[PDB]
Design a protein around this ligand. Structure first.
Ligand code: NI
Lengths: 70, 73
């Protein structure tokens, strides 16, 4: 009967891991303030990506469950 | 036939921007090698997130098309 495919998405980091990452420092290096400001945006985007996927999964569930009554 | 729209989510960066970003240097900054290796994972994750979202959006559009044509009662 009905057969679903299965796809897997592999991620390297979590927002938490980015929040908790401590870079080593050296004689010359990237401006800590500038890197921090940039990663702040990255962490926000990880949260937003996660939320949008959750929203899209819920929308998927909504549509599938409607079709349950077809 | 009638439609409404929303703008639910706000993003700050693209993967391309993270690949291309050039940081100012200074005394006692973060290890460039360490930061670059870290951001490489971020870049790959942005691409994967983006792919997953676009795949779900395509799937949902297929399902809405199916539902448009489906009798329920
Ligand atoms: Ni079968």
């Amino acid at each position: 009967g009905s057969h679903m495919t299965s796809e897997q998405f592999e991620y390297h980091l979590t927002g938490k891991e980015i929040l908790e990452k401590e870079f080593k420092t050296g004689l010359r290096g990237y401006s800590p303030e500038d890197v921090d400001e940039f990663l702040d945006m990255v962490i926000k985007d990880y949260s937003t990506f996660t939320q949008e996927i959750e929203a899209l999964q819920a929308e998927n569930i909504r549509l599938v469950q409607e079709l349950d009554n077809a």
